Design a protein around this ligand. Structure first.
Ligand SMILES: COC1=C2C[C@@H](C)C[C@H](OC)[C@H](O)[C@@H](C)/C=C(\C)[C@H](OC(N)=O)[C@@H](OC)/C=C\C=C(/C)C(=O)NC(=CC1=O)C2=O
Ligand SMILES: COC1=C2C[C@@H](C)C[C@H](OC)[C@H](O)[C@@H](C)/C=C(\C)[C@H](OC(N)=O)[C@@H](OC)/C=C\C=C(/C)C(=O)NC(=CC1=O)C2=O
Lengths: 206, 204
């Protein structure tokens, strides 16, 4: 189980706070994830200033959100700097209204457990191979992605939604939320939506 | 090397117990008394083949102590006890009311009323040690007070505010009785009588 890890005590306590104090406005997890994605794009953009190889694995700088209503999943993918394996283990397993306090203290990512029974973070960084981080909140593991490098560069956050969080699978909801929290993000944010013959394509939200 | 993490299974188990028994929480005492009884049963067996078994403490009892000022509830038995290695493994790894005793996870029902649970235990083959937890981790350290128990274990609960009622004597006596009526070992509750004096009171 050299791939299995446990959470630092403080993180456990922190996840417990978010759940007990934000259960009346769970929709903020989308805000927090879109915000994280945006900070990630800012860093690769900052890296491309000095390193001229920074953007060779994925020239674009976007944020695409997809709804798999059949597998009960919600995907949020950015083409930011991404995270190395060691960063998945250290930065997600430890740390150094409360709606505003979370993003400021650096723990807004855990707001995802407000609507998910399981969170998965797939990531490719310019200096490592693609890896997968998974957790149901009672432990977590990190393994090399057997699919190889399918992201180029960036991160995908996958949420296996709670049955009560089923509404986050309907497009009308996500679009409303994506739009409401995409307002001040300096990057384009699309949503895989239907157009009704009935064809699917990326739809710009901001 | 004094702070450990709970195994994933235990984590899952604590939540289940807490999510499903929030309606009948008084169960926690039944579970502690029951465990106390098992412990006593085991030292008694050992005393059959081991003449030195009861060297550290000749009695086979279970004593319950309420401390309102400090907000603590103590459950002490004089059974076989637990060695440091056992506290670590047997506690960190593994109506449903009567379904938890079966699986052997009753202990955790203590978190239904306690923000923090402490386990002090002295086992014939080791020195006294202390296991503490708030459910988000746990730690095991050598008791700096020495071999104070002689032999056995003390379950100390730092009761939640909404658990203020288990601090009241008449309540514990009432509860300790309903569940001690089946244990073949004497259960006492440090009670009081009005001058006002304190002394053990037999419940079964
Ligand atoms: C200031 O940076 C932020 C930090 C500090 C730190 C961990 C940054 C990280 O160092 C490895 C990378 O530099 C950064 C580019 C990676 C992301 C933003 C990831 O998101 C995507 N899309 O990559 C996010 O994944 C869930 C990382 C964990 C987030 C946590 C625990 C959180 O709750 N809040 C945080 C939000 C932040 O903005 C946070 O702690
Ligand atoms: C069958 O034995 C029981 C086990 C198996 C096992 C761990 C037994 C233990 O092995 C080291 C000792 O042999 C035994 C004498 C010690 C006690 C009963 C302790 O209580 C006192 N007073 O000593 C209790 O402390 C909280 C131990 C943890 C209890 C757990 C996790 C539980 O939830 N249920 C259990 C109840 C049991 O009866 C249980 O798992």
């Amino acid at each position: 189980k050299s791939e299995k890890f446990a959470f630092q005590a403080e993180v456990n306590r922190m996840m417990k706070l978010i759940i007990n104090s934000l259960y009346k406005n769970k929709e903020i997890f989308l805000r927090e994830l879109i915000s994280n994605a945006s900070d990630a794009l800012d860093k690769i953009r900052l890296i491309s200033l000095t390193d001229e190889n920074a953007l060779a694995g994925n020239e674009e700088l976007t944020v695409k959100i997809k709804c798999d209503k059949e597998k009960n999943l919600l995907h949020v993918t950015d083409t930011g700097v991404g995270m190395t394996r060691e960063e998945l283990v250290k930065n997600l397993g430890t740390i150094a209204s409360t709606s505003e306090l979370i993003g400021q203290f650096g723990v807004g990512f855990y707001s995802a457990f407000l609507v998910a029974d399981k969170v998965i973070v797939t990531s490719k960084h310019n200096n490592d191979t693609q890896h997968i981080w998974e957790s149901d909140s009672n432990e977590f593991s990190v393994i090399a992605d057997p699919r190889g490098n399918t992201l180029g560069r960036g991160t995908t956050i996958t949420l296996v939604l709670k049955e009560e969080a089923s509404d986050y699978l309907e497009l009308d909801t996500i679009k409303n939320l994506v739009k409401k929290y995409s307002q001040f993000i300096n990057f384009p944010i699309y949503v895989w939506s239907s157009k009704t013959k009935t064809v699917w394509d990326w739809e710009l939200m901001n």
